[PDB]
Structure formats: C-alpha cells, structure tokens
C-alpha cells in the first residue's frame, strides 16, 4: 500500500501543476511566492522515474515517454527567465503526466467499480481541468483592465462553462478576430466533450438492468409462443408464477448453465458443498468409498416442482430417486386420502427404484416450490458398473426382493 | 392493498414537503397558515417508522437511515425560531424521504412496466422537483423588489427551465458574483440532468424492437449465405416466404428453443395441452397406459412444410409418423392423378411405418403451411423397449403383415 | 393496391387537416374559401369507417376510438358558429387520425425498411407537424399587430424551431406571463423531442455494422488467446488470412450454423441445390436409389483448406472422401516430385477409402482456398446399413480388393 | 500502392473543389488567378474514369453515376460565362465526388480501424466541409458592405459554428425573411448533424470494453447463484481468485470455446504448436506413427487447478493422464509427509493409468495455477482401437503387470 499512497501523492502533484501552470502564465505575479512547493513537485515527479523503473520497456518507450517529458523541469525556466508568450506555452509539458496518471487509474482502481463509470469519472475530471485551462486561455487574450484577478477569473470560468455545456447565454461574447477564432475552436471542443459525456452516460445506463431484462424478454417469448399454441389460462398462469419464483429466488439464472462456467475441481467442490447435507445417510450408499459418492454427486440434475404438482404417481414403474434441497413434500396414498409423511429439506424419496423396478407404492405431491435434485437409474447403473464391490452389495440388497 | 394506499399517502406527504420547504424558506410569510397540515405530515412521517419496522436490519441501518433522518421534525424548529439563512438549510432533511420513496417504487411498481421506463419517469419527476428547488434558490439570492410573489417565481422557474434544458435564451442572466457561481453550478447540474435524460431515452429506444430485429438479421444472414452459394431465386424465395410465415405466426421464435426454458413438469403439461387433440385415438396406442402416452409425447419433434412440399413419397421405405397440428394435407396416388383424402388438424398419417418397414403406399403433399409433429421409428422402438406389454401387442399387430 | 392508394389519400387528408386547423384558428379569414375541400375531407374521413370495418373488435374499441373521434365533423361547427377561443380548441379532434395513420404505416411499410429508421422518419414528420402547431399557438397569443400574416408566421416558426432544437438565440423571447408559461411548456416539449431524436439516431447507428463487428471481435478473441499460448507468427498469420478469406467471401458466417435455421425440407432442398453438381457421377453410388443420395447429402460436413495445406497424406490409413466445391487441388506423389492431376470444382478424391481401409496412395495439397465437403466412413457405414442392396453391391466392389 | 497514392491525390483534388467552389461563388474576384490549378483538377478528375474502369457495371451505373456527374467540367463554364446566381448553383456537381471518395475510404482504410471510428471521422470531416459551405451561403445573402473578405468570412464561420453546435449565442442573427428561412433550414441541419455525432460517439463508447464486461457479468452471475446456494466464503473466494487468474492471463476467454472457431486443419496445427513440447517423449507412445500422435492430441481437454487442489488422490482407481503446460506440481506420498518430486512444464503424471487400472500410488497437489491437459482412458481406448500395432504393443506393456 506504500505504492498505493505514492500514487495518490503523484496524482496530487499532477493536479497541482495542472491548476497552477496556466494560472501563472496569465498572472506573472505568482511563481515568486510558490517556487519552493513546485520545486518539491519537480523533485517528486523525478523521483517517480526510479519508483516505476524499479517496478520489475526501457527509456524512450512508446508508453513511458510522457513521464519523462513531464519529468524535466521545463518550468522553473520560462517563468524564471520570463520568456515571451509565443514560446512559453511549451512550459505545459508537465500536463502530460495526466496521461500516465489515467493509465495508472484505469488498472489500479479498475477492480471494484464498473469500468463505464470509472471512464465517466475520469472524463468529468478532465473536463473540469480543461475548463480551468480554457478559462485561463480566454482570460489571457482580453484587453487590459484594472479589475481584480478574482473577478475576471469568475467571468472567464462563467463563459467557458456556458460554452462547454452548449447553453450559450450570450452575455459574454467575442469582440476581436483572435477572440472569435478562440471561441470557434472551443465551441467545437465543447460540442465534442458534451457528446462524449452523453455517450458515456448512455453506455452506462444501457446496461444498468441486465438480469431483469433477460428474464423479462424470456417471459415475453414464452408467453407469446404459448398464446400462439392456444394454451389454457390456468397453465399459462402456472408458468408465469414459476418464472416469478425463479426471479425472486435466483434472479432468473438457470442452475445448469451457471454451474458450468467453473472448472471441474471447483465444480466438484461446489457440488459437495451443496449435496453435503444429504448424501451421507442414504441407507444403500452407506459404507461405500468416497469416490463412489463423488461420482454420484456430479450426475444429479436439478428440477423445480410448483405447488401441487405430481412428482411420483402410485402404480407407474418409475426409475428415479429425488433429493429434497429447498422445499417440502407430502407423501400420499394411491387413493390420495391418507398423508403418510411430510418430507422436507435433506430427506429423499424414490430410493427403492434404483434397486429394482417395482412399481411406485405411493404418490408424491409438492407443497411449495421444491427445488429438488434427481438421479436416474440408467445413470446410476452406468456409474455403478465401475465399482464391482458396491454393485455386488446392491445386487445382494436386490436379491431380497 | 392497505399498505399499497399508505405508500401513496407517504408519496403525497413527501411531495408536499419537497414543494413547501424551499418555497417557505424564500417566503417566511408562509408556515403560519400551513402549520397544522405539516404537523400532520410529520406525524405521518413518524408513523411510517413502525409500519415498516413491523414489516417482518434494525435502527441505524445503511438503507434505513434516510427514513429516520427525514422522520424527526427538524422543521417546525427553524421556521418557528426564525433561524438565519446560513444555518436553516438543514431544514431540508425531509427531502431525504425521496430516496426511500424511490426505493419503494423501484420494487413495488417494478412488475408491470419496463424498468427502463420506470427509471425515466422517476428521473423526470426528480428533475421537475429539483427545478422547483433551484427556482426557489435563484429567487432567494436576488435584490429585494416589490414585485408580487407569483411574478418573480414565474421568472425564476423560467430561468431555471431555460438553463436546465440547455437552451439558454439569455434574457435572464447573472449580475453578481454569487449569482454567477450559482449559475455555473446549476449549468453543470443541468448538463448532467439532460445527459441522463438523453441516455435513458436512448436506452429505452435501443431495445424497443427485439424480436423483429433478431428475425430481420437472421433472414439477412441466411440470404447472404445462399447468395454466396448461388442458389436459385425460386428456392431463395421459398425460404423468404417461409420466414414470412414464421414471423407472422409466432414472431420468429423457434419452437424447440422456446419450449426448453421450462422445467420438466411444466414442459410435460404444455406437451399434453398441445398434443391433447391427437394422441388419444391412434388405433395402435389405444388401451395403452397413460405413462406410454406421456413417454411418446415428449419425443415429438415439430417440422413445418410449405405449400406443395413432399412430406412422404410413394415407394420409399420411410420410418416416420406425422401428426397434423395447424395445417392441411392431401394424400395423392403414386402417379399423382387421384386424391385419396384431405387430412387436416388432429388427424395423422404414416401410422403403418412404426409397425413394419413396408414401403410407403401413397404420396403426401402439403396444401398450406402445415406445422406438424413427427415421431421416428428408432425413438419409438427405443421407448417401446421399456413397455413389454405394449411391445408384445405391437409385435402381434405386426405378425399380421 | 387499391387499398394501398386509399391509405395514401387518407394520409393526405389527415395532413391537410393537421396543417389547416390551427392556421384557421389563428386566422378566421380562412374557412370561407376552403370549406368545400374540407367537407370533401370530412366525407373521405367518414368513408374510411366502412372501408376498414369491412376489412375482415367492433365500434367503441380501444384501438379504433381515435378513428371515430376524428370521423365526426366537429369542425364545420366551431368555425361556422364562430365559437370563442376557450372552447374551440376541441375542434382539434381531427388530429387524432394521425395515430391511426401511424399504426397503419408501422405495419404496411414495415416490411422493406429497418424499423429503427421508419420510427425515426415518423418522429421527424410528427416534429415538423407539431412545430407548425406550436408556431400557430405562439402566434395566437401575441399582441395585435398590422403586420401581414406571412411575416408573423415566419417569426413564429423561427422562434419555435430555435426553441425545439435547443439552440435558443434569444432575439424572440416571452414578454408576458402567459407567454412565459407557454415558453416553459414547449421548452420542456422541445427537450423531450430532441432527446427522442438523439435516442433514435443512436439506436439506428449502434447496429449499423453487425457482421463486421462480430467478425472483428472473434478475430480479436482468437488472436489474444493464441498470443497467450505463444504460437508462431507464421501460423498466427495463416489464421489471420483464413479469417480474411472468410470475411471477403461469406461475411464471416459459419456454414454449419447458418444452414441450421431452416426446417428439414428447405434444408434438404438447399443441400440438393449445392451438391447437385457433384453427387450424380460418383462411380460407386451410380444406379442407387434417390433416397440413398438424399441420405448421403445431409451428412456432408464442410471444411476449408488454405493454400498449401495437406488434405491427404500418402501412407496414412484414412477413411474420408472429399468433394471439391469452390476451389482447386493438386494430387502429388509420395515423394512429392510428380503432379498426377489437378482436381477442381465438381470432382472428388479419396473415393477408395469408403470401400476398404487401404492406405492412401498419393498426397493431396490445396492450391487455393478449397471450400470442400467431406464424408466419413463411420457415417457412410451407419447410413449404408439401412440399404441392403447398395451395401451388398459395395461389398462386391470390395471383394475385388 | 501506386493506386493507394492516386486515391490520396483524388481526395486532395476533391477537397480542393469542395473548398474553392462556394468561396468562388461568393467572391467572383477569384477564378482568374486559380484557373490553371482547377483545369489540372478537372483533367485529374477525368483521368480517374479510365483508372477505375480498367479496375477489372458499365457507364450509367447506380454506383458510378456520381463520378461521371462530377467528371464533366460543369465549372469553367458558369464562372467563365459569369452566369447569374439563380442558375449557377449547378456548378456544385463537383462535390458529388465526395460520395465516391467516401465509398473508397469505407473499404480501403476499413481494415485496421474500428468501423464505428472511421464513420465518425468521415462524419466530422463532412461536418467541417459543410460548415464551410454553409458559411459561404450565409455570407452570400448579406447586405453589401465594404468590409474585407477575411473579416466577413470569419463572422460567417463563427455564426455557422455557433448554430451547428446548438450553442446559439445570439450576437449574429437573421434580419431579413430570406435570412430567417436560411437560418431555420440550417438550424434543422445542425440539430441533425449534432444528433448524428452524439449517436456515433455513443455507439463507439457502448462497446469500448467487451471482454471486461462479459467477464464481470459472468462473475456477478456466479456469485449471485452461489450466494443463493449458501456456499462458504472460503470456496466462494477460491472461485473469485480463479476468475481473477482467468482474467489476468487470457482475458477471461474459455479455451475450448475459442479454439473451436477454427477449421479442422488450423485447429490441428494449433494443437501441434501447443502440445509440441510434451508429446514426443512419453515412454509408451514412443515409436508410434505420427497419425497416432495427431489422433491423441485433438482429444486433450484442458483443466485449471488452483493452488493446493488435489489432482490425484492415492488409493483411488483413476483412469486419466495429465500433461503439465503452464504450471507446477508436487508429488506427495499417501501420508503426505514426503515430497517425491516437483513436476513442471512439459512433464506429465498418471501415465500408468492408461496401461491398467491399478490404484494410484501417490497423491498430487498443485502448487500454483497449473493450466494442464488431461486424457481419459475411455477416449484412449476408443482411439487406440484403430491402431492394432500400437494396441498390441500396449497390451504387451500391460502383460508385465
Ligand atoms: C456543488 C457545490 C459547489 C460549490 C463551489 C463553490 C466554490 C467556492 C467559490 C466561492 C463562492 C462565493 O460565494 O464567493 C464568490 C467569490 O468568488 C470570487 O470572486 C473568486 C473567483 C472565483 C473562483 C472560481 C469560482 C469557480 C466556481 C466553480 C463552481 C463549480 C465548480 C464545480 C463571490 O464572492 P461574494 O459574493 O461574497 O462577493 C461579495 C460581492 O462582491 C458580491 O456578492
Ligand atoms: C402540459 C400543460 C401544462 C400546463 C401548466 C399550466 C400551469 C398553470 C399556471 C397558470 C398559467 C396561467 O395562464 O396563468 C399565469 C399565472 O401564473 C402566475 O403568475 C403564478 C406563478 C406561476 C406559477 C408557476 C408556473 C409554472 C408553470 C410550469 C408549467 C410547466 C410545468 C410542467 C399567468 O397569469 P395571467 O396571464 O392570466 O396574468 C394576466 C396578465 O398579468 C398577463 O396575462
Ligand atoms: C431543404 C430546403 C427547404 C426549403 C424550404 C423553403 C420554403 C419556401 C419558403 C419561401 C422562402 C423564400 O425565399 O421566401 C420567403 C417568403 O416567406 C414568407 O414570407 C411566407 C411565410 C413563410 C412560410 C413558412 C416558411 C417556413 C420555412 C420552413 C423551411 C424549413 C422547413 C423544413 C421570403 O420572401 P422574400 O425574401 O422574397 O421577401 C422579400 C423581402 O421582403 C425580403 O427578402
Ligand atoms: C486546434 C487548433 C486550430 C487552429 C485553427 C487556426 C486557424 C488559423 C486562422 C488564423 C487565426 C489568427 O490568429 O488570425 C486571425 C486571422 O483570421 C482572418 O481574419 C482570416 C479569416 C479567417 C479564416 C477562417 C478562420 C476559421 C478558423 C477555424 C478554426 C477551427 C477550425 C477547425 C485573426 O487575425 P489577427 O487577430 O492577427 O488580426 C489583428 C487584429 O485585427 C485583431 O487581432
Ligand atoms: N410410509 C412412508 N413414509 C415415507 N415415505 C414413503 C412411505 N412409503 C413410501 N415412501 C416413499 O415413497 C416412494 C414411492 O415409491 P418408491 O418405490 O419410489 O419408494 C417410496 C419411498 O421412497
Ligand atoms: N386411402 C387413404 N386415405 C387416407 N390416408 C391414407 C390412404 N392410403 C394411405 N394413407 C396414409 O398414407 C400413408 C402412406 O404410406 P404409409 O405406409 O406411411 O401409411 C399410409 C397412411 O397413413
Ligand atoms: N493418378 C491419379 N489421378 C487423380 N487422382 C488420383 C490418382 N491417384 C490417386 N488419386 C486419388 O487420390 C486418392 C489418395 O488415395 P485414396 O486411396 O484416398 O484414393 C485416391 C484417389 O482418389
Ligand atoms: N517417485 C515419483 N516421482 C515422480 N512421479 C511419480 C513418482 N511416483 C509416482 N509418480 C507419478 O504419480 C502417479 C500417481 O499414480 P499413477 O499410477 O497415476 O502414476 C504415478 C506417476 O505418474
């Protein structure tokens, strides 16, 4: 962090020069009672050279020539020698340090803020600094007057702000050919700057809601298609409330498409974190090796059931086993008159299907949105074929009907 | 809804304060014949504290400190005691309730309107309210005059509107250093506000047509590729009219990609809704269990045939069976001189292919765009292998040639 | 088209009213030498009612009430009776026909133009028409003067155009409280209109190049990844020139992803159009049924070879057969000292691989970008298993070594 | 390049005409001491006709009529004959060459610059040129004055720049009906031009960061989903630092999705470039044919392991073999108390798994981010089935336990 405060000091010295140099060009009465601070400033700006050359691309580099062009005290010379106005503008080389400061900021602070906002903040800072420079430029090429320095600077800053925002009141206007040329030049500059601001704000806003518009558009697409297919309002309302649940819980993201941007080891660690509250107590995987567990966990597919949907129907063959994660379930009878149990988070049903293909013995209805994971029997057999010990033990559990 | 009218009352009291406080700061002649209504207002704004603390994150919360900062009657004190202008601006803490009102609106009404439009409406309301505040601020720092209150408020609102829209006529301009500083500040504010408005409008418009531009661009892509491949105008016109039919019926959405954003139970319910008018009367699935039906319905693939395309050619082996959904079909002979029948919505053809691989006995031509669903024979056998009873019955129907 | 000229006549009568009604409100000296044309206009606007009610949603419809609100001659009454200004503004109901005209245009002409440009054109037309209306409104509430009608209309249109574009010269300004309120209202309107124009232009431009930026970004992605992987400049230049060829020929579109947005019958017809110049003369598919041909054509995968790349290497086993489409090929010897032949568009090589897996007998080098299609041997066997006659004939051709 | 300098000469002559023609219409005192250069210019503009007709679509073409309309000396006639102002405006046909110049530029220079920036540069050039033309137009229709030509041109350019940027000071304003009509027309033109500039800048900025925002949004999506799934901060921090590594190394691009936009031969050449430092020294593929190597290289799947993750666990069966590319590895013992070796870039482990399925003999932990490639045993057997010699040799190496 001792570099991350020296960067702030460098920014402060750069903004000292970018506020003092033009204000001193217009007012030679300065630079006498400010010389020590700017000599300290020059020594600081030359002490940055070894503090970034020792930052583990040598001199005269396409990206490091601005730093050396701002490094040399090319001030302390024109003001000390009192060079005439036509040639003393080259004292402004110190302002080239702003480019290096901006490249620093666009990669140091560019971790915890939206880049389209960092760009806008940098642009606004540069606009304010350029407005100060333009105000000094306008105030330089005016007829001599005995008005104090503070008043005419206020008038100059007022004029440049009313020109750069493209408001243009018209109470301060050019009166001389050179003033007219200057005004044309910075009218073009102000139009460009304001266009840049509007473009940056439009780019910042055009992506301020992303998940919400993606979800909204997928819902519109689904509803248009089902309105074409002539589907009942009851089901076309069940689908709407399912999408409502999806948005309110996980911002509409699809589980299987999100958990696929991860590499295999992080994906496996996430899968263990999730199915760590279930798959240790299943009374047919008990005592199996950890690799069998790690093999049956990467092949669990999620599925969400709304309130009242049939998960399992009594009498049908069935082959799946379901693990409840974030919901609840009621086990009813074939005639649906008795409620055997209310399974909830952590528990599971359908366990007997993996052993043999006996028809289901009870019906299963969701009570709320369940958000549960299912395992097939084809997948279970496929990944059981590689573990002869557990496969033989399950075949034994099968031979008992 | 008794919360959804109290929110409206809270909005009304907040906008009462945000219109009365500055207008009373400029005009001390008020606050005498308005005190009861604003004391009712303060009691209402303090009765909001338990009506959202009992909303099932305690005091001094990063998102609930504005409410308590606007809650305390920090008005009723500066106006009653007639505090001087430099310090009485802290009476404006009541305006912080606007932030809580906006957070309320951006999630209560944020269900049935495009979020990019709700944001624009909130921004426009805030601009009007800030323009009132800025007009009062400008009207405060003017030389004393005997003009009535209504006239100078009209002039102040005129000036702030002609500054905030960046029009800037110039007939009302600063005449004092403090007025010039104020004008600079709100010129910057007006440029920012107008840039925000333009960005919001651009973001709202840049996605006003989505399905249409997606369809248009896929048609351009297809036509460019086939123009490269040197394909006849006849076929490159058949493709254009197919895309025309797709757009005019289902807005260009792909059937198999839309009906895939649904979970398995909702997808199965949609599939039953669609194929509920066909698969109950097929005279070889008759009497089969409901699970067999639910298994053959999830494996039907759609396909659209244009007017005059050959669906089935007499003599070829063939293995598929087609279900007509939203079109019509004519069954012709091998020599294509006799029209056996005109099948339409609900009916089906190719049924004998699933039984055995006898060559097709008649040709089939579309009459309009058909929009029909097909089932393979490999898929039919694959999902028939799991139902020995129906498989044996179909083998019996096969042994009769 | 006799409806598609009556729509133009309706547009002309609507724009006659939207230009005449305000200009007559300001100038009562009209409406005497213009009554017959507007009575014809009213009869035309009432003859539109049966010409769209007989357009194969009855009266008092949410989308057809503007037409009936503009239909009744609510003009011909205020001007004939000379109603006072406060109440005669309701004569403007005829302008509601503009909404129906716009809904007509946004679906009639909305086939052959970019919708983001049709929207902009409609917006610009509405802006010009509203500027005429606003000019008449401003010219109504002015002090009486003896200036001619043409001059004060020029001044009014000048003022409203310099206000709506947010330029605001300031040489024509309000001078009365009612003029100030009017100016505030249309300053807000002009800011909104100009923001709409800027948003529409930004949306129109932000998608003016699509294929080009997609291609450019995929090339940047590829080059960044290979620069990370430290790949030679020679190969990283071969890839660049391959992408150059892709862009210059088919605008960077991927063949297998474009020809997949088509249904199966159109895709098969396109495949026959493309492989119609090759697969009739292959001397082992000769005499096979048309269905075998239609089966081997849908399984041809494209592949592009740059200039000098090895397609087939002598000695390797190999299993594929390649069909030249849009390039050229030279067949060289194992020692690469003799050029046996120069195959070109239409011809094919590797034919003997499908029969048996004898090692390749000669090497094959591309001369230019080839753009050729390949067929496997696994796919060929898979789709040959369903044709016993052709399979037996090929086995016979195989038994001859 | 001798065409690529003649294009620059054509651009220079076109910009000579587009700066001289209006300035000569206003000032007839020119065209006497400039005739030779513009006669050279006309001969140059007529020498472009054969230098693009011989560019390997004949005369009177929809895209080449502007060139012939600018080709004929329709100047050198109105100025020589001194035609009156109403009809001499047709001398401006030379400016139509700008359209051909722009079509040239939008495909010659349109290779190494972002198209949205080339469009903006062309628009800005056209705006400056049109501002010169508009300044000349405004200066033509002014009352006669004895002011010098340079001064009134400065005033005219000042007025047109303050109108086109929508600043509108108001110190130069119309004073005549024709001046008012001209000012209205170019107020509309300036609003359109400035809207175009803002739209182009917004489009240029709205895609200035693409990889960064894609990466940022995928990280937000992942973190929101895992915050919903209630995953530990330790693992939800491991995932964040993995995404940090991905961004800092390869800009967040997915390896398997980037290296899939390439055709098969370029993909194979890239794969050899990458796995050229490993797969020549594996002591069981040694001596195998080059085709076996080229077959095992296209089936290597990448995977990234963070610092400390278990790649291989001692005791588990295991079937994979891993090739280290851009990281490091430490081989530890079953009790994890002894470090056998430190494998690094180029080396590989797990080689014995392909031979037989003996349990792993040591554990393997990453030391830094590894970025290594893995080969299965199912894939190895699948692609070994096609090489009987190498398969037999590996079976021999297997029969030695
Ligand atoms: C957001 C909030 C921002 C606040 C910025 C405030 C900046 C502080 C500047 C001080 C503002 C101030 O009130 O004092 C002025 C001094 O300015 C002067 O002359 C000194 C010269 C002015 C210095 C430059 C002013 C630029 C202000 C740029 C503001 C936007 C920047 C973002 C006027 O004196 P004062 O009325 O008592 O005279 C008495 C009699 O002559 C007439 O009143
Ligand atoms: C969209 C449609 C919007 C309509 C807003 C109308 C607001 C109603 C304001 C009333 C407008 C009005 O006609 O009355 C004015 C009163 O304003 C006054 O002085 C009282 C002070 C003005 C109050 C604030 C006016 C802001 C208007 C902001 C409008 C845009 C807001 C969006 C002028 O009196 P009046 O000519 O008879 O005098 C006679 C003689 O002295 C000169 O005519
Ligand atoms: C793109 C090209 C567009 C061209 C629009 C031209 C519109 C034609 C309008 C006619 C323009 C015209 O030259 O004639 C004017 C008549 O306007 C009048 O008074 C009649 C009233 C003016 C009618 C409304 C003018 C709106 C112009 C809106 C233009 C942009 C619209 C897009 C002035 O007369 P004139 O100098 O000889 O007097 C002699 C002495 O008194 C001073 O010169
Ligand atoms: C970015 C940087 C851009 C720089 C552009 C500079 C253009 C060079 C133009 C020359 C500018 C210049 O300083 O000379 C002017 C001559 O203009 C004249 O009259 C001749 C007529 C003016 C020629 C056209 C000027 C357009 C400038 C457009 C600039 C933006 C374009 C982008 C005034 O003379 P000057 O004060 O000594 O008189 C003495 C006494 O009468 C009052 O001072
Ligand atoms: N009495 C019960 N209490 C809780 N769960 C049950 C009960 N009876 C059956 N189940 C579960 O419901 C499932 C339905 O049939 P299965 O064969 O899939 O296996 C069954 C068990 O998992
Ligand atoms: N006379 C007929 N009327 C209606 N449909 C028929 C007739 N003859 C054949 N078909 C259908 O057309 C199909 C063509 O051959 P298939 O063997 O596929 O099965 C046939 C029936 O489904
Ligand atoms: N003399 C030749 N002229 C043209 N083509 C040839 C010649 N010899 C071999 N080929 C082709 O080159 C192929 C290389 O080996 P194949 O066995 O694939 O089949 C070969 C033929 O298709
Ligand atoms: N002493 C060692 N030095 C380096 N690598 C080893 C050593 N012992 C085992 N390995 C590697 O670690 C792997 C772990 O078990 P495998 O059977 O996969 O094959 C092993 C070798 O690839």
Residue numbers in the entry:
A (entry chain D), B (entry chain A), C (entry chain B), D (entry chain C): 10 to 65, 74 to 418
Give sentences copied directly from the paper behind this entry.
Here, we used SthK, a cyclic nucleotide-modulated channel from Spirochaeta thermophila, to define a ligand-gating trajectory that includes multiple on-pathway intermediates. cAMP is a poor partial agonist for SthK and depolarization increases SthK activity. CNG channels are tetrameric channels where each subunit consists of a voltage sensing domain (VSD, S1–S4), a pore domain (S5-S6), and a cytosolic cyclic nucleotide binding domain (CNBD) that is linked to the pore domain via a C-linker comprised of four α helices. Meanwhile, membrane depolarization increases cAMP-induced channel activity, suggesting that voltage modulates the agonist status of cAMP in SthK, similar to its action on other CNG channels, although the mechanism is not known. Cryo-EM structures of VSD mutants with increased activity yielded cAMP-bound closed states (identical to apo and cAMP-bound WT SthK), as well as four additional states: one gating intermediate and 3 open states with different degrees of opening.
Tyr26 is located on the S1 helix, and its hydroxyl group is coordinated by the guanidine group of Arg111, a conserved arginine in the S4 helix and presumably important for voltage sensing in SthK. Removal of the hydroxyl group, as in SthK Y26F, abolishes this interaction, which can conceivably facilitate S4 movement in the membrane. SthK Y26F adopts two conformations in the presence of cAMP. The majority of particles (1112621 particles, ~91%) was in a closed conformation, identical to the closed state of WT SthK (RMSD = 0.4 Å) as expected from our functional data (Po at 0 mV is ~0.25). Importantly, the Y26F mutation does not lead to any local or other changes in the channel as gleaned from the identical structures of WT SthK and SthK Y26F in the closed state. In all three open conformations of SthK R120A, the lower two helical turns of the S4 helix of the VSD are displaced outwards by a small kink at Val118, allowing S5 to move, which creates space for the expansion of S6. This lateral displacement is not observed in the closed states, which show identical S4 helices in SthK WT, Y26F, and R120A. In the closed state, the bundle crossing is stabilized by an inter-subunit salt-bridge between Arg136 on S5 and Asp226 on S627. In both cases, SthK Y26F and SthK R120A, the mutation did not lead to different protein conformations at rest but altered the relative stabilities between closed and open states.
